[PDB]
């Protein structure tokens, strides 16, 4: 029990010793940081956890936020590894701290992880977010939190104090405040807190960078396969009101804001979850019903606006994407697409999938996309058509928003390091044609290959330690390099970025510059006319 | 004799010309039409009535009244295209070159239609000298003057006083004269290969698309032009707008009968002096009086016609030069000039797009800028310079020829395609301009064989291959004889480069670029 009993503001905690081949770590799981956002507190901001008295057992993970369970491929590891692995509940606002045993002599750098899941899903408890290996290897203190999702975390009737929007992000913020007030007791350094996250976790990290009351709560950021300025990452006041009303309709509520929210509040959570997807405007991929909302408080303006107008001198940021960001999403409703075969689509299906992958744009905009993503010597090649829709969805949802994010952060004074991740896990359950899909760098960052119970290769263990080292070097100093092949900063002029895989770092220039010119310069002029 | 030949119009006398390969008999200045003068200005041409006696044909005749280029006075690069004989409306003469002695058997015939944007040109230019091609390949060559400018293409559609397209009818009539007479010069009326460059190529295409030109030739060769090019033709409404503007510029009052009457009484120089100023904007690669879509010579727009398959499926050989656009840019694009590297600024690139692609929406300019920027390096002057040269040359020459070649191949025609990449040793234009529009002609015409000129040993060898390619196409429809030049097909799109090195096969003529101009851009324009 040495170093397993720790006192925090809320009270005494009991942790548990976790083991790794490189030695032990002290974990404190299921630490409450808010009063449960239950009953009358549904859709409300979170309130700090009142002091429990005595000793709170922190040896197990806690309930996961009520959320949709993916059923596309029941039993498949490639999807189920993202599904909840604990009982579902609204009583879900708990966080986790892993620290080395013994705790370092000197206050150690803190990494704070924010999971993705399109703001509709996720949990800090997934096998793939296990913090033991980063902590043991790099002697970092690591935190993660559950945050509400779906309607529970992002349904908004903007203007109301009863459903103001963005409460899932406020969940994250309150966790960050808990860290400032408490990680020292775990050996963590509150003056060196690096947020990192993936997809929606990465968009969440973007928003903390831009939300004024979050900015004194961390120092450096990392955004993996996501940006706050992506077309799926946020929604206007009006569109969030329309979707809220539509869920209220779908769960049986009659057709002011007070009585509407009261009705939402008396329905059971399963019922909210049952209807979530049908509030969207068209069948589509890469869109999610309840996402942050531009409320004029947490986000004083659109992310595009706030990034353009922001000063970022002496902020260090690290961002990137995987080689094949679009592929995963295509099996969720693009015709001709499956995990179970090479998904060699026809041309008609390609033409169709453009309207799913990029929903709610003019037929003229579709015409423009089709033009850009067609090899005009070989427009009928099924393979080329499959890969091109992948690029369309990849570029539009992940790569181009990250490229703009990066150009703008450098321009407005940030040191930026940027990567593309190009190693396909030896153990990957998805077929060859999906390439290095979205989400599949995370297990290398978290050092899962070091798990003896799993079956990665010698080289994959070496590669994970490189990545953990880059990420932890960034966290310590804002620079992922040490004396002894350099990762150079991304500037707006040269646009350097690096490929990460088994081979050494290779420096390249320009994250799909031609294609992102299309999404970022031209297409907004077309729609706007 | 050898030089006294009888034709339907009467007897001619020609002149023996000498080459290093031996002699040729050339008959220059043969009238094929009544002078299109006075009440005949703007009118269809009428066949030349039999003259009596012997018409001396040893001498090139007058050139159609036309604008004289004054951009760079005395520069061989511009002056070689300028008129080299006295100007006149009495300019409807054609020229025949045949071997000395004549061929034992009926020879293939090649008929040349000069370019010049339909505003300029003449058969008498040094560079269209037929003597080397005739000698070297035992081919009979014809070229005609045809009316340019307002004289050949001003139209008040509907009227019989100025119906449109008379420059083209001049060409048709010449082709008819070839049917009726090249036998007398040793040529074979059943093997007439039509070829031309720029506007001349567009012209050739218009004849392939025009029912009334139907049994007048058997194969065709379009160099650096296509009838479906956006400079090549104009609508009735636009032609009418422009003929009215010309009338106003020459002082006529603002009933087609009276307007043309007034246009007829002004002198030709007065028409030429106001010619550029009828164009809707300041631009490059636009010409004022061009073919009009009349429902007669052109039943419809050339686009509609090829897209519909309305054409003679003749064998064709078509191609372009490596830097089609560069020449035109010095004619009004800011920052351009033959006297430096023309390292334009980016603001100069953006204005340049409006000049090079005139009269399109703001949004369409945006789409062009998008496609023709390297976005890694949008500030490099060299790249911006070369990129505007691609914009201009793709829109006006290359993509129209590609669409022309796709549509011809899809409807069963044998199509050969080339990109010509040899920059002449003697080229007066700066490097930067690369291998510009027009600078393949000297090679096709075998000019390097002229001992008084300064071409390389390799250049003469090159020239012989090209005349060989062209002339094998003339005889057979196929330029090869026992490395292949393969047919261009709509699936594979194979074409060859032509320079010093042997043929290298390649695929798709700027396919990505031309998809922008041929598929995307029209859908955008018609949503505004």
Swiss-Prot record, chain B:
Q: What is its main location?
A: other
Catalyzed reactions per annotation: acetylcholine + H2O = choline + acetate + H(+)
Q: Which residues form the active site?
A: 198, 324, 437
Give the family from UniProt.
Answer: Belongs to the type-B carboxylesterase/lipase family.
Its quaternary organisation is: Interacts with PRIMA1. The interaction with PRIMA1 is required to anchor it to the basal lamina of cells and organize into tetramers. Isoform H generates GPI-anchored dimers; disulfide linked. Isoform T generates multiple structures, ranging from monomers and dimers to collagen-tailed and hydrophobic-tailed forms, in which catalytic tetramers are associated with anchoring proteins that attach them to the basal lamina or to cell membranes.
- The entry marks the following residues as binding galanthamine, namely 81, 197-198, 327
What phylogenetic lineage does the species belong to?
Eukaryota, Metazoa, Chordata, Craniata, Vertebrata
Classification via Pfam families: AChE_tetra, COesterase
List the CDD domains: Esterase_lipase (cd00312)
Identification of the protein by name: Acetylcholinesterase
Q: What is the organism field in this record? A: Homo sapiens
Q: What is its EC number?
A: 3.1.1.7
